[PDB]
Coordinates of C-alpha atoms in Angstrom, one line a residue:
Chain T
X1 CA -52.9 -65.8 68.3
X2 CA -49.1 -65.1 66.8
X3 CA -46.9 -62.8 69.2
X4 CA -44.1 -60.7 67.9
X5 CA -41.8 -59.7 70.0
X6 CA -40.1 -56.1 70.8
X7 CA -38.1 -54.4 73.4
X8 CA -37.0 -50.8 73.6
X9 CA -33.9 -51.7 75.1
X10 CA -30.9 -51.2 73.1
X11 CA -33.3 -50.4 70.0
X12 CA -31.5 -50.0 66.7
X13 CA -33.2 -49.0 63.5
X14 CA -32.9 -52.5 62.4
X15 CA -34.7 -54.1 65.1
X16 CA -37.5 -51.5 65.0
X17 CA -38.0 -52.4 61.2
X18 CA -37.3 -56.3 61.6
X19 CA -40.3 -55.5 64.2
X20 CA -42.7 -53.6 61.9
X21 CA -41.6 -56.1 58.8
X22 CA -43.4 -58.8 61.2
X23 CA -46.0 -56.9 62.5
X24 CA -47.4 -56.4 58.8
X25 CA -46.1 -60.0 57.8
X26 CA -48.6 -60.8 60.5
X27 CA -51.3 -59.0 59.4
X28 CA -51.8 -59.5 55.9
X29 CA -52.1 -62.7 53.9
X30 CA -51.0 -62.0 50.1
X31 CA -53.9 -62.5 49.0
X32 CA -55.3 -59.3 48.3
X33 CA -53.3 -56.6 46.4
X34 CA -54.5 -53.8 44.9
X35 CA -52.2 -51.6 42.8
X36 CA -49.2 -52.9 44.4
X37 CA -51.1 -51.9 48.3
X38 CA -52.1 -54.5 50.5
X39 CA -55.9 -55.0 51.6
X40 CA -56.0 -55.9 54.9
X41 CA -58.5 -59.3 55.8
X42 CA -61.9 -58.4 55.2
X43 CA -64.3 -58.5 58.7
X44 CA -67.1 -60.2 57.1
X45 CA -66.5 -64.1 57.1
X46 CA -62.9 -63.9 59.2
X47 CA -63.1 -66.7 61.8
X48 CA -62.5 -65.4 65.5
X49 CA -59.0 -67.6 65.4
X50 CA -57.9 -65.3 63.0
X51 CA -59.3 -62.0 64.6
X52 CA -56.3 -60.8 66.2
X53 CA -52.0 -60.4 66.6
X54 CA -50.5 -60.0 69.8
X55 CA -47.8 -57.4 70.0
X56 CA -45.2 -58.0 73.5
X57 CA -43.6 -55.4 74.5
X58 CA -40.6 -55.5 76.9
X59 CA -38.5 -51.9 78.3
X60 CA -35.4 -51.7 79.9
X61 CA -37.0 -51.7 83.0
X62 CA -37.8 -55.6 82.4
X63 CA -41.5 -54.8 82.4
X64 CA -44.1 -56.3 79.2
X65 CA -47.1 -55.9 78.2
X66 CA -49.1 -57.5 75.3
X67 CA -51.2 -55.2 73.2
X68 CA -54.0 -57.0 71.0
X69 CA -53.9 -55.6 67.5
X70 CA -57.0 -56.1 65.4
X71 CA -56.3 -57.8 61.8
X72 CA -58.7 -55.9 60.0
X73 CA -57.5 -52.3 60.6
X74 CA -54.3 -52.8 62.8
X75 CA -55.7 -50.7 65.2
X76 CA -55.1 -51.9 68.9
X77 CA -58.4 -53.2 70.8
X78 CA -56.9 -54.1 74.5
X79 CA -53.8 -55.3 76.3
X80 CA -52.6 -57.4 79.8
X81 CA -50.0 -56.3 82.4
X82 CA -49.6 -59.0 84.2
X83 CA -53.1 -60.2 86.6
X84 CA -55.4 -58.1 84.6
X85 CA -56.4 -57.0 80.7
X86 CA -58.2 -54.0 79.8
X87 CA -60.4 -53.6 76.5
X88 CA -61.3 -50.3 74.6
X89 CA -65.2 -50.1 74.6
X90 CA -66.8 -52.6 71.6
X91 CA -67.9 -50.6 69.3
X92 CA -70.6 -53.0 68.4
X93 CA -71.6 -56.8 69.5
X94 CA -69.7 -58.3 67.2
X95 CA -66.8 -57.2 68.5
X96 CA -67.5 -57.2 71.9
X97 CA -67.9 -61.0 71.5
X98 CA -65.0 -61.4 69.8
X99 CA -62.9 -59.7 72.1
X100 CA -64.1 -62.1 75.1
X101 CA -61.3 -64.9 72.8
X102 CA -58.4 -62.5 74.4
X103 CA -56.3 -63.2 77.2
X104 CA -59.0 -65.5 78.7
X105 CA -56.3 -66.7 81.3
X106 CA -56.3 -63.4 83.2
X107 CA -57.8 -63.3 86.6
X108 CA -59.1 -59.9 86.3
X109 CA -60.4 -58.2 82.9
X110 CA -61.7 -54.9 82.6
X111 CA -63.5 -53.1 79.7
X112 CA -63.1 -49.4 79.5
X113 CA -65.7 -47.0 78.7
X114 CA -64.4 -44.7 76.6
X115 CA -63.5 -45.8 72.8
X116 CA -59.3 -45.8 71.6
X117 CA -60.0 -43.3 68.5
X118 CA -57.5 -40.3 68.8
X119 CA -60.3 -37.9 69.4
X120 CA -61.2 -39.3 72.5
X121 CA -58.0 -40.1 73.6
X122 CA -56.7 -36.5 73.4
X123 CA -59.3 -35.4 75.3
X124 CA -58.3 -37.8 78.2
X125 CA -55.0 -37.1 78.0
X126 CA -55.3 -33.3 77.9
X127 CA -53.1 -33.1 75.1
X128 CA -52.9 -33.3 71.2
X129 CA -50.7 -35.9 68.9
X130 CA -48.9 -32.6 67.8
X131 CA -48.0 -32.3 71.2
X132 CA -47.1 -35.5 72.6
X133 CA -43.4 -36.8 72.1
X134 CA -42.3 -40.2 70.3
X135 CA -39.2 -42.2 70.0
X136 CA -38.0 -45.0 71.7
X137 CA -37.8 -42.9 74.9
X138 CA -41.7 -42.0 74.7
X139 CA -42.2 -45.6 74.1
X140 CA -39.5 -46.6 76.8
X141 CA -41.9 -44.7 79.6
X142 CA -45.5 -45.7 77.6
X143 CA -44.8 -49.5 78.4
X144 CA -43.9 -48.4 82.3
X145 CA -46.9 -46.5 82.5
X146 CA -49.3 -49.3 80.8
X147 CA -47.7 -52.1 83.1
X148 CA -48.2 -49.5 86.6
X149 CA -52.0 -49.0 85.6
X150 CA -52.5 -52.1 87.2
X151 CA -51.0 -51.5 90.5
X152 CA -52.5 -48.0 90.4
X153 CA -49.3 -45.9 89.7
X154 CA -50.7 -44.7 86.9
X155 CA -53.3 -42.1 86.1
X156 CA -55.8 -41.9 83.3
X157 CA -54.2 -38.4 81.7
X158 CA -50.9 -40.5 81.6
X159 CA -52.6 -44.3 80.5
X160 CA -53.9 -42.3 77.4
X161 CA -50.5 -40.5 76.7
X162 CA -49.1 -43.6 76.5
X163 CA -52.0 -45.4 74.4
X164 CA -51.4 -42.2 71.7
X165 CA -47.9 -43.1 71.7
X166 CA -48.1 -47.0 71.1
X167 CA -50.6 -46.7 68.3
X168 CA -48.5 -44.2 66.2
X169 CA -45.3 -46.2 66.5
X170 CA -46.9 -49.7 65.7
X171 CA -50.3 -49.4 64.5
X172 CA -49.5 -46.6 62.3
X173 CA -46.3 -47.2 61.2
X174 CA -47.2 -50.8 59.9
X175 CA -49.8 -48.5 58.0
X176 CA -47.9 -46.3 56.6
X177 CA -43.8 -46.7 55.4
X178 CA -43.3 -43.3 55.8
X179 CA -44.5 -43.2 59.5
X180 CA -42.4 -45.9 59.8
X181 CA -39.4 -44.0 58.0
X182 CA -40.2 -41.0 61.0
X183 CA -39.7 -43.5 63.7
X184 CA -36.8 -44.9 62.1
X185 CA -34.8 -41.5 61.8
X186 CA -36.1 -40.9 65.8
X187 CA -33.8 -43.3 66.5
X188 CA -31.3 -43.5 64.3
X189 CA -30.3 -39.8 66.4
X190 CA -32.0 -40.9 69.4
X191 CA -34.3 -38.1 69.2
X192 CA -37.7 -37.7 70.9
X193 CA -40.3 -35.1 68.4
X194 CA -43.8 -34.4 68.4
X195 CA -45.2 -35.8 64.9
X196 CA -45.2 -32.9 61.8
X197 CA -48.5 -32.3 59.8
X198 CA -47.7 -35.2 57.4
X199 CA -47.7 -37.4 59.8
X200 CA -50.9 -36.3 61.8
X201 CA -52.8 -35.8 58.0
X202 CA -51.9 -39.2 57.4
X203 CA -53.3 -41.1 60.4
X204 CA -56.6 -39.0 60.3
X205 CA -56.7 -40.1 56.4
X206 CA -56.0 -43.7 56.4
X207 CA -59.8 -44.4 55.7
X208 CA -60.4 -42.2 53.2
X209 CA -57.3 -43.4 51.1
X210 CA -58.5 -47.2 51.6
X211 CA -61.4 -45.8 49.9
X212 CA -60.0 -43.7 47.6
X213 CA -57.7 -46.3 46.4
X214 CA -60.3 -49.2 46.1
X215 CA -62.7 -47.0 44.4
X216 CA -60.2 -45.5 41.5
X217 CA -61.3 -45.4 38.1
X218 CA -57.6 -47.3 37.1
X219 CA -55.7 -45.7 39.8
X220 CA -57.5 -42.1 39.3
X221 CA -59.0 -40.9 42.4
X222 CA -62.7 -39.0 41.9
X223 CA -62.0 -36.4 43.8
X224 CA -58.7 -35.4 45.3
X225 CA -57.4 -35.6 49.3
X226 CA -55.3 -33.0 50.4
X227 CA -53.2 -34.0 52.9
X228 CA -49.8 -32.0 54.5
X229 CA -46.5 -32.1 53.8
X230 CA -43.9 -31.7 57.2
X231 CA -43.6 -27.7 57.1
X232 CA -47.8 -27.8 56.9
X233 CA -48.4 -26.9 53.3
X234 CA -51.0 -28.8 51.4
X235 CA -50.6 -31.5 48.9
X236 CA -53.2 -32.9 46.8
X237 CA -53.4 -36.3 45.7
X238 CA -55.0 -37.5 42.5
X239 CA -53.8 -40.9 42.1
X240 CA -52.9 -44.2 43.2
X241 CA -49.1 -43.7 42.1
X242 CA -47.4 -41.1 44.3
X243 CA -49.0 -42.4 47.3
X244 CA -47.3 -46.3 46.5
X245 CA -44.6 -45.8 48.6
X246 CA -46.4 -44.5 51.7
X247 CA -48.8 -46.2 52.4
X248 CA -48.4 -50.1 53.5
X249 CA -51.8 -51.6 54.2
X250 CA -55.1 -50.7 53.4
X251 CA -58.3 -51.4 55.5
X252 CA -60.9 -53.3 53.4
X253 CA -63.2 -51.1 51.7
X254 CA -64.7 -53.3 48.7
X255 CA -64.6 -56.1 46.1
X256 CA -61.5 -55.4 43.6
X257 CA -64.2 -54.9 40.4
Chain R
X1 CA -26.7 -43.4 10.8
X2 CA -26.9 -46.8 12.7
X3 CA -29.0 -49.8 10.6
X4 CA -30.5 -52.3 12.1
X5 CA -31.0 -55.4 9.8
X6 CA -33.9 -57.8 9.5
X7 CA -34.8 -60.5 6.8
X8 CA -38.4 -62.1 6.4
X9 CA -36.8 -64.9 5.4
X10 CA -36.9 -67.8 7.7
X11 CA -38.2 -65.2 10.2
X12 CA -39.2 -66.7 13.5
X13 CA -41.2 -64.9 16.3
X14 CA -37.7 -64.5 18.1
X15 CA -36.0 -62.8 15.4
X16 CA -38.8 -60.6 15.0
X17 CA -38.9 -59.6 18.3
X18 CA -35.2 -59.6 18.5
X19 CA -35.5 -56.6 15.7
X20 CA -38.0 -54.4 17.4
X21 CA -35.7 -54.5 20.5
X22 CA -32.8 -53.7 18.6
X23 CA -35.1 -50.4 16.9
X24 CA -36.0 -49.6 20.2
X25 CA -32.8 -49.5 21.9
X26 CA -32.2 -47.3 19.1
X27 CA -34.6 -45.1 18.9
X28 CA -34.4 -44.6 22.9
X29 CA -31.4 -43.0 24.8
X30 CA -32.6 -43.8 28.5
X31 CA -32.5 -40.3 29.4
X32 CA -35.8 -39.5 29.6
X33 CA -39.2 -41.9 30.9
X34 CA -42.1 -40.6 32.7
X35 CA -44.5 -43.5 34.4
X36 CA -42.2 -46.2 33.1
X37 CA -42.6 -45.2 29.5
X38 CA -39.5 -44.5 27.1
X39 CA -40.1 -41.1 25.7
X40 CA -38.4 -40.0 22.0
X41 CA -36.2 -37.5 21.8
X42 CA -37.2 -33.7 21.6
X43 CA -36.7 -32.6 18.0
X44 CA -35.6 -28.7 19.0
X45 CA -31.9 -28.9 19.7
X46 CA -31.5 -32.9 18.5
X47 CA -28.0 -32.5 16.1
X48 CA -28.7 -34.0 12.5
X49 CA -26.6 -36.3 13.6
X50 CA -28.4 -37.9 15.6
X51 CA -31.7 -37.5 13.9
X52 CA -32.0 -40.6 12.0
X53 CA -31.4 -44.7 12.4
X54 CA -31.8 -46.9 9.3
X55 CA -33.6 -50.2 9.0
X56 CA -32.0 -52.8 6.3
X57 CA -34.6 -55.3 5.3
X58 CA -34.0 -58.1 2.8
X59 CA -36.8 -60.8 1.4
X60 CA -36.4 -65.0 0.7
X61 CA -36.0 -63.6 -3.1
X62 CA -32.5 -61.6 -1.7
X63 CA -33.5 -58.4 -2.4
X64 CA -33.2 -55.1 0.0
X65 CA -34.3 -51.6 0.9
X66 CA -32.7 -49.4 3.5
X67 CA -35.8 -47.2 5.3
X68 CA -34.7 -44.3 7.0
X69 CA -36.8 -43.6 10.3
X70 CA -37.3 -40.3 12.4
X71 CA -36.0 -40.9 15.6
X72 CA -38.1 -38.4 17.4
X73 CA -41.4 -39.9 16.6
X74 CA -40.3 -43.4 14.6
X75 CA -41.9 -43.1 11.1
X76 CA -40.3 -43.5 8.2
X77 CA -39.1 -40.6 5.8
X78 CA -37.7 -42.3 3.1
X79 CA -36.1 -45.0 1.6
X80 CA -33.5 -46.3 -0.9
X81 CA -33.0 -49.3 -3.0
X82 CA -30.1 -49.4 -5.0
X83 CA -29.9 -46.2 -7.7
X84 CA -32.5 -44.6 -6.0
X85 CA -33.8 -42.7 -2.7
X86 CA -37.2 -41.9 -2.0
X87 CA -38.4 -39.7 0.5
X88 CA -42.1 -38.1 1.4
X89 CA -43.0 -34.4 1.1
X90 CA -41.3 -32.9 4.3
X91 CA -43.7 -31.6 6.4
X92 CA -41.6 -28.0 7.1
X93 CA -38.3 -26.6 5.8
X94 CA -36.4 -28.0 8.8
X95 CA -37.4 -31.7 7.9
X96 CA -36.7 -30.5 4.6
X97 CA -33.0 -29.7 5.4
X98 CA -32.8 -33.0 7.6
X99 CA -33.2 -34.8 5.1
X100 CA -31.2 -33.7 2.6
X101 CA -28.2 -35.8 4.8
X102 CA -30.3 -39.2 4.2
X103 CA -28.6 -41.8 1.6
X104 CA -26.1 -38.9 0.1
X105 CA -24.3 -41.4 -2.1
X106 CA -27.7 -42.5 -4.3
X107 CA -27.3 -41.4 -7.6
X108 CA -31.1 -40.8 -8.4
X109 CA -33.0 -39.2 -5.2
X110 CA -36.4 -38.5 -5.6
X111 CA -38.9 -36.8 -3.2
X112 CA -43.1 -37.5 -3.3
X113 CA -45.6 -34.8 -3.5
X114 CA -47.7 -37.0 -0.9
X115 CA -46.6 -37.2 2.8
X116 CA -46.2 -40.4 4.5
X117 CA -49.6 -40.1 6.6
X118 CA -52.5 -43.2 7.1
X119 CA -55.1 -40.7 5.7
X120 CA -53.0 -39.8 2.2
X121 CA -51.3 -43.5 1.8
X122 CA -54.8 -45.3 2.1
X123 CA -56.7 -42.8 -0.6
X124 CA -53.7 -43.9 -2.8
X125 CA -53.8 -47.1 -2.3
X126 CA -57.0 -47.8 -2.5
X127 CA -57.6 -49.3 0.2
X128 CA -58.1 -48.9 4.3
X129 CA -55.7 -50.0 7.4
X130 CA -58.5 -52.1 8.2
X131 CA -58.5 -54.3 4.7
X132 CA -54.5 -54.9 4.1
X133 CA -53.1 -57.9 5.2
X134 CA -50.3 -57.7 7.9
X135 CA -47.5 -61.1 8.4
X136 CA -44.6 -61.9 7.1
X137 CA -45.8 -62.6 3.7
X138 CA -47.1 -59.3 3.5
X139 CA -43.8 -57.8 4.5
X140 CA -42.1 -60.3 2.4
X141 CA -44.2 -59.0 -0.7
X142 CA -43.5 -55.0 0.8
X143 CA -39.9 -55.5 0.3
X144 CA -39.9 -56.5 -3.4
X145 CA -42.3 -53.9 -4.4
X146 CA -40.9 -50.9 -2.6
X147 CA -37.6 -52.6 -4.5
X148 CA -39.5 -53.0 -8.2
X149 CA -40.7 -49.1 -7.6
X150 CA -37.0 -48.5 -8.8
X151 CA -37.4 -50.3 -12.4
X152 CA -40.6 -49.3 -13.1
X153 CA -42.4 -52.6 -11.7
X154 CA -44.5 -51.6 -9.5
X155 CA -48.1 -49.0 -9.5
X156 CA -48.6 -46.3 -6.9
X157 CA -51.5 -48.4 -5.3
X158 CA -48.8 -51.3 -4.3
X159 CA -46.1 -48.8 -3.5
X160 CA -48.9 -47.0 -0.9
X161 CA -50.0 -50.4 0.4
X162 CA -46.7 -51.7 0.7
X163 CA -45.8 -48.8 2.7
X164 CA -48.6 -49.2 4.8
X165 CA -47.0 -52.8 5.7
X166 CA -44.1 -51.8 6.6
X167 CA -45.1 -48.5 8.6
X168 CA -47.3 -51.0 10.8
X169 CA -45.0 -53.8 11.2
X170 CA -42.0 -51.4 12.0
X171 CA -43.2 -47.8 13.6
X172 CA -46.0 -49.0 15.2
X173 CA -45.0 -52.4 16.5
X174 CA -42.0 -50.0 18.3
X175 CA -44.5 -47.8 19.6
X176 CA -46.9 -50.7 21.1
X177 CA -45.6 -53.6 22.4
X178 CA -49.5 -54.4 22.2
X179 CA -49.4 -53.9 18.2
X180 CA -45.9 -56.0 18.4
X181 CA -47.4 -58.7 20.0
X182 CA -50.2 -58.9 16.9
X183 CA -47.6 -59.3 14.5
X184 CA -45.3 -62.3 16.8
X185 CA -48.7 -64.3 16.8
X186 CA -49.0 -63.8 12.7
X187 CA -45.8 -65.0 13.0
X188 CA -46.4 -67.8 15.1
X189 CA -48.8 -69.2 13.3
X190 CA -48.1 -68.0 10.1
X191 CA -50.9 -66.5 9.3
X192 CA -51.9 -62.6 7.0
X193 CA -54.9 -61.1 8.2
X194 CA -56.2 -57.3 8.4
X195 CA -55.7 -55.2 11.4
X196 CA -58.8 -55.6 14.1
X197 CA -60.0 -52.3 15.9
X198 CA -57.8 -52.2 18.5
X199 CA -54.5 -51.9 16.6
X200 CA -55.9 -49.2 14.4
X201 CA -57.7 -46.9 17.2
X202 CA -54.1 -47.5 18.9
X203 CA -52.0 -46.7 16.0
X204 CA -54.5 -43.5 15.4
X205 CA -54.5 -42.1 19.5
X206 CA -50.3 -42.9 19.5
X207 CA -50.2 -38.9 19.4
X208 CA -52.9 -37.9 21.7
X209 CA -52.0 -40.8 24.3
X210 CA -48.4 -39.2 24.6
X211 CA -49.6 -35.9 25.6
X212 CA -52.3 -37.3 27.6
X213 CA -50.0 -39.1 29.9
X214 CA -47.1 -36.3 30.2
X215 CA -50.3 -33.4 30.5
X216 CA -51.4 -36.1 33.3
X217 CA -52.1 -35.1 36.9
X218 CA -49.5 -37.7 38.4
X219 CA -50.9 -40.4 36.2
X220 CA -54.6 -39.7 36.0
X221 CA -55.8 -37.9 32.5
X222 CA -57.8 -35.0 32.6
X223 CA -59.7 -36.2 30.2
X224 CA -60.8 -39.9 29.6
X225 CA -59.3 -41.5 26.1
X226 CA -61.6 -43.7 24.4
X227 CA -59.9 -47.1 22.6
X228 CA -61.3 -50.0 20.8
X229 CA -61.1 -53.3 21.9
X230 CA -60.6 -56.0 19.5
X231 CA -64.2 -57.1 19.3
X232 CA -64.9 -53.2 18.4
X233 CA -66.3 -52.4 21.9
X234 CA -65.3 -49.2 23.6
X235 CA -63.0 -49.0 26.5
X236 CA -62.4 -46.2 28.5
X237 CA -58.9 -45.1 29.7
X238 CA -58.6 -42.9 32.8
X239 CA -55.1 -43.3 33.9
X240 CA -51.8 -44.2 32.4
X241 CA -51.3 -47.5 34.5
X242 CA -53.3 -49.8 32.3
X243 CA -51.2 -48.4 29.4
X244 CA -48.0 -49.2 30.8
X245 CA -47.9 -52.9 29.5
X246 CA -49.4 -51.5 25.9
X247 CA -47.3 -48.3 24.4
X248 CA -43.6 -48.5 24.6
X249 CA -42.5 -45.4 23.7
X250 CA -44.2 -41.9 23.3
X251 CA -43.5 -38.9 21.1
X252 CA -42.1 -36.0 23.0
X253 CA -44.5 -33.6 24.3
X254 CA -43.5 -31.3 27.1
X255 CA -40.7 -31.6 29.3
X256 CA -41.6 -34.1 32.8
X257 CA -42.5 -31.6 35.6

């Protein structure tokens, strides 16, 4: 699968969005566009050898690891450190067999139990997104703690810190520009934040605004979303147009008509 | 006032298109587009000015008329040729005063009881939108009559449809860039023929599409707009996006949130 390549070390706001530029350069083909949005592949029909992106991720400690990213909603599915490579619980058979196409040259593979949607993880790591740092020092100590899970240094509350911080800074910030714009200004002043409202009511809506947007009478949403601005007032959304430059992918919801 | 000059004669579908750029530009200061779409200037507080550009046309058989249009909604008030000035019953005293500043050098000025509306100008001439020939050598034939109306030449049911020619192939192919493209393919191919359904429920909505798109909940209407296509069937507009490539400018309605 393609590999794109980061490191925190000496992280500029450049690299971080020559990074992201890839990452979604990666993940979409060009041919799907919907009022200036990219659709992300559609599941039905993709062939395994397209299935997945492999992100490596390198810290100034010299340690990688290589998180598997899923095409079809950027979300990520697993990742190796080193001997071994763990897997979030399939959520059905299809992609538990598709997952057995990643990594296949590590000696030891394990599958976790629990799934890698933010509700669980929160749970296991005793802590909510609004509470939980991120910058390039969050992410600095989130590939540390990834890498250590294999020798046993790490514990679970801290492997699901870090899995809450690496899917906000990549996953969602190829989702959304403006995510990506909050990361950006983190460090441009080296700063380390938990994420505002805007950001969290973003994240939990990416799905309904695929929808939403794919489902418009002409850009004209149904029914509105409400979402929150960074001091936690509400916002509604009505149509395709304001939302153009936020959000940066779309998961595949239907046919455009 | 600034003129803007156009002959029929040897006209091509680049000088024609050349024109309504120029009116336009004109008509247009830049200052003010909501959704990508030029709107007019606001009549309360516009200095008289600045109220009015003029549009020199000339025929193959060298003869010319100097219309005068509104530049807060593009229409045409009036007109001269030679002696004489011409202008339709102003709709309030303002418009009244306006245009007393129109062609102040004519010797004879005259002012119609009638106003220059579709619904007054078709019962005089006899004759719907949807039955007068629009081209070049309609235009060509608009010129001389609107001319001849000076010397006694030419009966109120030519003058009407006449100015039903030139309102169209003027005013309306400045508001739509869909009505303007009509009129380059008569060109093209030289051909005269009536006005399908599209152009006339266009020309007719030109008002309520301008306050449906600045009354619009960031771009979707409250209310759907119904249009005709050119085969006569309905179509349904819900948001101003798939208008964006068909009116060009809109009259001034409210100020942009």
């Amino acid at each position: 699968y393609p590999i794109i390549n980061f490191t925190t070390a000496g992280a500029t706001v450049q690299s971080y969005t020559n990074f992201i530029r890839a990452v979604r350069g990666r993940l979409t083909t060009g041919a799907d566009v919907r009022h200036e949005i990219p659709v992300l592949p559609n599941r039905v029909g993709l062939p395994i050898n397209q299935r997945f992106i492999l992100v490596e991720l390198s810290n100034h400690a010299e340690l990688s690891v290589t998180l598997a990213l899923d095409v079809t909603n950027a979300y990520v599915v697993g990742y190796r450190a080193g001997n071994s490579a763990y897997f979030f619980h399939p959520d059905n058979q299809e992609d538990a067999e598709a997952i057995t196409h990643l990594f296949t040259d590590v000696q030891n593979r394990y599958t976790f139990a629990f799934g890698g949607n933010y509700d669980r993880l929160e749970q296991l790591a005793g802590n909510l997104r609004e509470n939980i740092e991120l910058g390039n020092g969050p992410l600095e100590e989130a590939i540390s703690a990834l890498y250590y899970y294999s020798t046993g240094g790490t514990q679970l509350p801290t492997l699901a810190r870090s899995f809450i911080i690496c899917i906000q800074m990549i996953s969602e910030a190829a989702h959304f520009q403006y995510i990506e714009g909050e990361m950006r200004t983190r460090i441009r002043y080296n700063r380390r934040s938990a994420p505002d409202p805007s950001v969290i009511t973003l994240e939990n809506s990416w799905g309904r605004l695929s929808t939403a947007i794919q489902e418009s009478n002409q850009g004209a949403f149904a029914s509105p979303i409400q979402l929150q601005r960074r001091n936690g007032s509400k916002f509604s959304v009505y149509d395709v147009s304001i939302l153009i430059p936020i959000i940066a992918l779309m998961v595949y919801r239907c046919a455009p008509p």
